[PDB]
Nucleic acid binder design. Structure first.
Lengths: 248, 397, 524, 230, 50, 76, 228
RNA sequence: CGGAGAGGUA
């Protein structure tokens, strides 16, 4: 079902997931054996003795075994719920030793190293060494990809600061923060800064005309008179301060 | 940073990774508050060489004066250490002390983690930081389509499932008189019956109700007809719960090998079989609250007749302007036929010319319907109508 | 006050300059994309290029108005796929990481339309982006005018930006998986199927290995024809018989002409592949370098898969004498502390004594573990046992520099041991437990202090690094190279830095990339 | 020079599980043919599957019927595992009607002459009330591979009937394919191998017809390669 | 023991007998609010003290 | 198709005015005024301009004389 | 149901050796299965003619230089592998390489049997300088399949030829490069289709397209008895 | 919707 990068284990130290994999392999092996006997319709005594063996596994472990449960019906339902593996309870700092896990592997008739040789269904050649295969409990976190995609070219427009914002029918653009401007700056990247600041960010007339140009079939933009520059120019001029446009 | 007095009072390894790590702790498993407000941890009293099952809830400062053995001490006979020298902790630091000099014992090996961290199996093999991310991701799990027990667990799954209220626990023991997808009816045992006739006990089960995270919560009746039950057992599994066991995620077949570079950093490759089984499949519930308002141009009305719309949008609605329960809708379709009486008929000549040229309807009421937001879809499962006194109760209400 | 708000002129910095024609999505790995490509979801492309798609649709006459174009795109007809392929034939896109802490933080790529809902980033670029694959979301922008597109192609694309703009040197180095594949495939053994024979170039090496007749690892003489750049830039094809391994010849197939065979021999580590890419860049150029990088990624991934290098629990090896060295350490510290109660050593004295004892014990344990690893596999040649590079997967796992270090694989199998306590001082008793073996409650409790300290340190350093980047950019931004030569014969004395007896850095490293302020002479 | 592989005994471990063996297979063809057949079988085999479910009482997937011990969602998830075959026509509509208490099983379905339930003990749901009665109409059609819940709605432009239940149809009749190459001994020459394929299927396809379908598809694929058009 | 338990026993590997079961995990909130809202024959936390 | 800029770097050592001149070339075959001088592979005008400048066909002197040309015709 | 057949195969040839055969579209999972089955057919077992045993003027050696030529035995061993020989008569036939005088000993110097063709005109196999300036090699060219090490045959034969007659490895497979890649294709809505592109290079005896098409014919005939 | 206050994630 799942293939995991073996690179994450020896660096991030969480080899606990490997022990989980081996123990889940053993548990699902016991489940496979009990499921086979269910399909074999083995005698209730056979299921009772095998399950008692499985629960009796391990030294100094107190879990207590049948027959204290009902002879047939409770045993039958227990096996029916156990045909998808033995749920294993492992106290966090008082849990299973590796030897016990390997004992469970023997009881599952599966390899003692937790390693069995696969074949790549792509090619169909066994890999040069056996790999680790088991059962791992995986959690689907709430960070769903549908909740993380959002992309736009047009849509919501705000006031005061003309930039896509708000709403979820079409969410706004991406915060092209000053770090991104700086990254463009370190590169010889100059123009892309101009579009990401002037013509596709704020100036409504420029955005409209430039969308019109693209729809016309040509990727078009003309620098001309930057609108924010003209706004700031009039703004300074109202202060009784004249801004000369002298060219070097 | 963690003080060495958090041992067994708050979980040292569970805290959000944002700008408030360490400011936001979680209570330990066995920790509790004293009458004054300070926290205490249970500890088995060690008489002279015997660790009694008697427990004392040592306070934060009380722990300081005393010496406490580790929870991993090995005890035989009636509670004697097999070790003349035992690991202990006196001020927060470890030490090795005489077996006849210890004052108290940790009641449990797991008494220093949160419930979030306690569920992680083989916690004694992870990095503390990595297990911290693990505990923080315990909480963020979302209920799958079915609840699947973890084959490798800690044993606190039952305690967490029962103690949280998502589990319909049998209040009074008896035999299940009736099982259904929504209700459980227990014919209570007569010895637990009350004077007079309290009769049966009815457990109505929450079914597909939006949780605060827009995740569907519902309860599956795990018991069947005539099944005896006693006080304190599960009648119905809640979300992310199987047979009274907390079932956060699902068990996958896993192979550890960098298969053709599709697992580069931590990226995980999944079989199409997982999608086949519809496991790791999640239900999500949205709320689209449409409120009628009382305005100065006329109080808004919820109506099935909306101007300037086609028959397709109206065909999913009842006569009351609210969409059918169970209709498949997508982003844009009308759910609630809200209209605001346009008491202001005067408008600019541009608006009138535009509505005349474009062929749009002209009325004294303006459209205000709550359509499905673009980007969401699905099937309508609940319609709730809140109508304060003084307003007519429509057909849906 | 309307002159200046925060952070300044409102429309040129924060806040908050969100811009259209951009998207944001979590990232996945695509190990089939070429280095100048990124895998972009079909819906993301469809909604990023709606104006271009409308222009094309009305250009082909398939639509007569914007309304018809809207209907045509929303109906998801098969025709719009050709339209989008046309508008995306080579129209590049700009991917930027959410924090951009260096120049490479934003790079261009050629988008390949893919199924799914995540951005398939090139695996070899994510290291340059300083990103990972943990739910973190990348952001795409589309430089949408011609001149911005060309600014992207000539400069923004990862092909033209492969060296770090911080110290030179490639930043596109294979990081963890492909390096494991290469380290596996180029390793040698002392005995395997296919040992000793002679094969006509790497032709027959590939033929025989992919027959499964000859193991990938074997002492094999192969007649290779390697090309060398000489004279004014001509290629000389030197053909010679070389003692190599089958996989090494199969890899030599990857390396283009004009490269020596001195690079694709020996077990290739991360530093070795760094060296190979650096030499390829400095000897052939960029195009051979980019082709080499892409091909070596593909081969490394493929042969990592064929390797089946896997991590279990029997692979990590517990030294047989670890407990013995430990018990010796407790005996020594018991003697020292007995002297302490005897009033023979002061508090600092026996503190330092115990710390030194446990450091020595940790060193001995790590040495024993590494000695167990380095020749854990021993194989006979024709009857006598021989050491050789361990087939053990955990040994390749870090020896390749895939991920981890001697310290980390030292703390898995052996003790992570000594560490700091609250107030930042070392504990008298180390963390005497591994991760393969269990951790006691108190041990994990103590270890938690370091993890919490590190996480708080991480957050604070992220914030302070952002601030420092800000101040340095503000002080340095008004500085542009504008003249080719000012004739300034002035310069700086520039020397290899040496502290004590050890030469910390070579003058060879420093001198590279500078221009002399005088004409250097010979030392004689 | 090259012999031709021949069908030999196709044993039946069960209805689901069967072993098919090919004895006269030349050198360098064991694993090759095994991978060929396994990929064809798991990738492309016709199969009958449930697509649309019409329960009389409930309005949507998450609406739970009164009387049953199971959500309609779990009823659909069990309906997915319905082992059904139709060989008289491509698409059929099974009907199930059962009242009273007890486990509503697949055997209770009103079967036609062209429809076979190869698993007639498949527990569809549990009816836990005498008054309660379950009335199902199940659409079963032929197909290949896996069709997730996103496509047939475009074949009808939204499910115009309400109360219709859409189900991920998994038509794959096979669930396990494995091949083993073993040294076969025959008087002719000295080096030949048994190709023994274990196949766990849903009981809806014969192993002989399955292998024949796989071989026919492989031959159609190799048609272009036998004769290169350019 | 428990009827729900006997339906599916999750095998345990614990080796130290568990003295004292896990307490009710919402005991803090229940204790707080019961102390806040109960009647008090003296001056003690809650509406009585206020 | 050619998306790498090494040849254009060698032809124009600045490789930065290269961007400007190739962008102008792209700008005026994208809109009328000149037509592509290299066979089109369904390529965007960016890469056809890039392939033009790679071949040595478009250089600063050639482009400036060509542009001054289209003026003396457009006044005439 | 319906099946998607991959019409319109494209081919690109470099000389008569290096063929890139592209085909589209193959449906999900079929592309790589076809690729792997084809490469196994092409590599592991195809009819071909290759050298099996050779004659040394002196004793057989693998560690000594040629008696009277300053070139090694190993290098002629390697060159004769690449010799493009096509036997049109009986499988196991003697070839005589008898060339005297100085110069580059190539394929043309070997005699022609009239049913043993050498489609490779110039293939350097030795270089005679004036030590004796004469070479006389008696070799066996035989038909086989796939690749056969000399050790396998020498262990399988109880009879050993006299020292001087040394068994040489046989490259029976006429195709020396085999590689195959599967890249994502796209047809209308579906984007799970995959192009299959195969890169193959022959010894030169046969055209790569002919080799691959006759291999496909071999596998189809393998499946003749299993198709309705 | 302009900017501040709060939880969560990365």
């Amino acid at each position: 079902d799942i293939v995991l990068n073996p690179l994450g284990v020896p660096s991030r130290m969480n080899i606990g997931q490997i022990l989980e994999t081996h123990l889940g392999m053993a548990a699902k092996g016991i489940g496979d054996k009990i499921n086979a006997m269910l399909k074999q319709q083995q005698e209730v005594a056979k299921l009772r003795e095998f399950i008692q063996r499985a629960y009796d596994l391990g030294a100094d472990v107190r879990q207590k075994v049948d027959l204290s449960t009902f002879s047939d019906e409770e045993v039958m339902r227990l096996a029916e719920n156990l045909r998808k593996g033995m749920p294993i309870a492992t106290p966090v700092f008082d849990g299973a030793k590796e030897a016990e896990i390997k004992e469970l592997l023997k009881l599952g008739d599966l390899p003692t190293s937790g390693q069995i040789r696969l074949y790549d269904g792509r090619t169909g050649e066994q890999f040069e060494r056996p790999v680790t295969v088991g059962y791992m409990y995986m959690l689907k976190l709430n960070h769903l990809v549908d909740d993380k995609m959002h992309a736009r070219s047009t849509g919501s427009y705000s006031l005061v600061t003309q930039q896509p914002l708000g709403g979820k029918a079409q969410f706004g653009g991406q915060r092209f923060g000053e770090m991104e401007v700086w990254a463009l700056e370190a590169y010889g990247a100059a123009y892309t800064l101009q579009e990401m600041l002037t013509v596709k960010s704020d100036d409504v007339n420029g955005r409209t005309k430039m969308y019109k140009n693209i729809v016309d079939g040509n990727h078009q933009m003309e620098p001309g008179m930057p609108e924010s520059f003209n706004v700031l120019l009039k703004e300074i001029r109202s202060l009784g301060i004249n801004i000369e446009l002298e060219d070097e | 940073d963690v003080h060495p007095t958090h041992y067994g009072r708050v979980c040292p390894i569970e805290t959000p990774e944002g700008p408030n790590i360490g400011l936001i702790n979680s209570l330990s498993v066995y920790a509790q508050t004293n009458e004054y407000g300070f926290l205490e941890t249970p500890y088995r009293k060690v008489t002279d060489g015997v660790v009694t099952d008697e427990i004392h809830y040592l306070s934060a400062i009380e722990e300081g004066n005393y010496v406490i053995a580790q929870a991993n001490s090995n005890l035989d006979e009636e509670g004697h250490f097999v070790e003349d020298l035992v690991t202990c902790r006196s001020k927060g630091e470890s030490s090795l002390f005489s077996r006849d000099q210890v004052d108290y014992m940790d009641v449990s090996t797991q008494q220093v983690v949160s419930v979030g961290a306690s569920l992680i199996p083989f916690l004694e093999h992870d990095d503390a930081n990595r297990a911290l991310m693990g505990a923080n991701m315990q909480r963020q799990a979302v209920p799958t389509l079915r609840a699947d027990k973890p084959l490798v667990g800690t044993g606190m799954e039952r305690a967490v499932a029962v103690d949280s209220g998502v589990t319909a626990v049998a209040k009074r023991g008896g035999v299940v008189q009736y099982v259904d997808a929504s209700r459980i009816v227990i014919k209570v045992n007569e010895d637990e019956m009350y004077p007079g006739e309290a009769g049966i006990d009815i457990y109505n089960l929450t079914k597909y109700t939006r949780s605060n995270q827009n995740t569907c919560i519902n309860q599956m009746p795990c018991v069947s007809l005539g099944e005896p039950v006693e006080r304190g057992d599960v009648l119905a599994d809640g979300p992310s719960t199987d047979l009274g066991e907390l079932a956060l995620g699902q068990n996958m077949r896993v192979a550890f090998m960098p298969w053709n570079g599709y697992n580069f950093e931590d990226s995980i490759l999944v079989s199409e079989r997982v999608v086949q089984e519809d496991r790791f499949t999640t239900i999500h519930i949205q709320e689209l609250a449409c409120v009628s308002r009382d305005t100065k141009l006329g109080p808004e009305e919820i109506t099935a007749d909306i101007p300037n719309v086609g028959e397709a949008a109206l065909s999913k609605l009842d006569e009351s302007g609210i969409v059918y329960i169970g209709a498949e809708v997508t982003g844009g379709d009308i759910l609630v036929g809200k209209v605001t009486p346009k008491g202001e008929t005067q408008l600019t000549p541009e608006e009138k010319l535009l509505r005349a040229i474009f062929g749009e309807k002209a009325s004294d009421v303006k459209d205000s319907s709550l359509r499905v937001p673009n980007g969401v879809s699905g099937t309508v499962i609940d319609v709730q109508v809140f109508t304060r006194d003084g307003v007519e109760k429509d057909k849906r209400a | 006050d309307m002159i200046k708000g925060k952070q300044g002129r409102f429309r040129q910095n924060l806040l908050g300059k969100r811009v259209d024609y951009s998207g944001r999505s979590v990232i996945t790995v695509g190990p089939y994309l070429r280095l100048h490509q990124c895998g972009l979801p079909k819906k993301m492309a469809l909604e990023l290029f709606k104006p271009f798609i409308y222009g094309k649709l009305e250009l082909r006459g398939l639509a007569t108005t914007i309304k018809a174009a809207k209907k045509m795109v929303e109906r998801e007809e098969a025709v719009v796929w050709d339209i989008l392929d046309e508008v995306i034939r080579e129209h590049p896109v700009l991917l930027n990481r959410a924090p951009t802490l260096h120049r490479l933080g934003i790079q261009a790529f050629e988008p390949v339309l893919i199924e799914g809902k995540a951005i398939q980033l090139h695996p070899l670029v994510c290291a340059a982006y300083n990103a990972d694959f943990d739910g973190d979301q990348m952001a795409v922008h589309v430089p949408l005018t011609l001149e911005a597109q060309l600014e992207a192609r000539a400069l923004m694309m990862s092909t033209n930006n492969i060296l770090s703009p911080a110290n030179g040197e490639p930043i596109i180095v294979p990081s963890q998986d492909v390096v494991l594949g290469l380290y596996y495939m180029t390793r040698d053994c002392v005995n395997a199927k296919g040992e000793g024979m002679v094969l006509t170039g790497p032709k027959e090496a590939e033929r025989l290995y992919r027959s499964g007749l000859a193991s990938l690892h074997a002492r094999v003489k192969v007649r290779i024809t390697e090309y060398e750049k000489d004279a004014n830039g001509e290629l000389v094809a030197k053909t010679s018989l070389k003692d190599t391994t089958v996989g090494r010849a199969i890899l030599w197939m990857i390396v283009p002409k004009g490269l020596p065979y001195s690079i694709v021999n020996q077990a290739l580590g991360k530093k070795a592949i760094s060296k190979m890419l650096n030499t390829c860049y400095r000897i052939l150029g960029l195009k051979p370098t980019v082709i080499f990088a892409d091909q070596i990624m593909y081969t490394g991934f493929a042969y990592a898969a064929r390797s089946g290098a896997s991590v279990g629990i029997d692979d990590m090896v517990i030294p047989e004498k670890k407990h013995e060295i430990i018990s010796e350490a407790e005996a020594e510290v018991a003697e020292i502390q007995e002297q302490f109660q005897s009033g023979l050593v002061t508090a600092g004295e026996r503190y330092n004594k115990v710390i030194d004892i446990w450091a020595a014990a940790n060193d001995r344990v790590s040495k024993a573990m590494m000695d167990n690893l380095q020749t854990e596999t021993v194989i006979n040649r024709d009857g006598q046992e021989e050491k050789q590079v361990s087939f053990n997967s955990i040994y390749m796992m870090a020896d390749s520099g895939a991920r981890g270090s001697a310290a980390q694989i030292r703390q898995l199998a052996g003790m992570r041991g000594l560490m700091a306590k609250p107030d930042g001082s070392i504990i008298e008793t180390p963390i005497t437990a591994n991760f393969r073996e269990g951790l006691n409650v108190l041990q994990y409790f103590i270890s938690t202090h370091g993890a919490r300290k590190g996480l708080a340190d991480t957050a604070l350093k992220t914030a302070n690094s952002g601030y420092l980047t800000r101040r340095l950019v503000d002080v340095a931004q008004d500085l542009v190279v504008t003249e080719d030569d000012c004739g300034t014969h002035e310069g700086i004395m520039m020397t290899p830095v040496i502290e004590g007896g050890d030469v910390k850095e070579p003058l060879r490293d420093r001198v590279l990339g500078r221009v002399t302020a005088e004409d250097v002479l010979k030392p004689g | 020079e090259f012999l031709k592989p021949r069908l030999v005994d196709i044993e039946q471990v069960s209805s689901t599980h069967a072993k098919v063996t090919l004895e006269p297979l030349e050198r360098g063809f064991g694993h090759t043919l095994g991978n060929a057949l396994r990929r064809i079988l798991l990738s492309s085999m016709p199969g009958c599957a449930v697509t649309e479910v019409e329960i009389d009482g409930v309005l949507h997937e998450y609406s739970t019927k009164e009387g049953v011990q199971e959500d309609i969602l779990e009823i659909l998830l069990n309906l997915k595992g319905l082992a059904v075959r139709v060989q008289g026509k491509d698409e059929v509509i099974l009907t199930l009607n059962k009242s009273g208490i007890g486990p509503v099983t697949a055997a209770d379905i009103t079967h036609d002459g062209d429809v076979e339930i190869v698993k007639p003990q498949h527990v569809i749901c549990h009816l836990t009330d005498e008054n309660a009665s379950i009335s199902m109409r199940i659409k079963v059609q032929r197909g290949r591979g896996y069709v997730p819940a996103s496509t047939r709605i475009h074949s009808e432009e939204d499910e115009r009937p309400i109360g219709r239940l859409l189900v991920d149809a998994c038509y794959s009749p096979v669930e396990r394919i494995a091949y083993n190459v073993e040294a076969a001994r025959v008087e002719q020459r000295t080096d030949l191998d048994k190709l023994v394929i274990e196949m766990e299927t849903n009981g809806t396809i014969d192993p002989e017809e399955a292998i024949r379908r796989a071989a026919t598809i492989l031959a159609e694929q190799l048609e272009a390669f036998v004769d290169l058009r350019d | 023991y428990s009827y729900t338990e006997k339906k599916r026993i999750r095998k345990d590997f614990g080796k130290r007998p568990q003295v004292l079961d896990v307490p009710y995990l919402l005991s803090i909130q229940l204790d707080s609010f019961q102390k806040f809202i109960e009647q008090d024959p003296e001056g003690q936390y809650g509406l009585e003290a206020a | 198709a050619r998306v790498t800029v090494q040849d254009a770097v060698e032809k124009i050592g600045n490789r930065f005015d290269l961007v400007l001149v190739a962008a102008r070339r792209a700008r005026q075959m994208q809109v009328g005024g000149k037509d592509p001088l290299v066979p089109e592979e369904n390529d965007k005008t960016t890469v056809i301009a890039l392939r033009e400048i790679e071949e040595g066909l478009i250089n600063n002197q050639i482009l400036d004389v060509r542009e001054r040309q289209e003026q003396q015709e457009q006044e005439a």
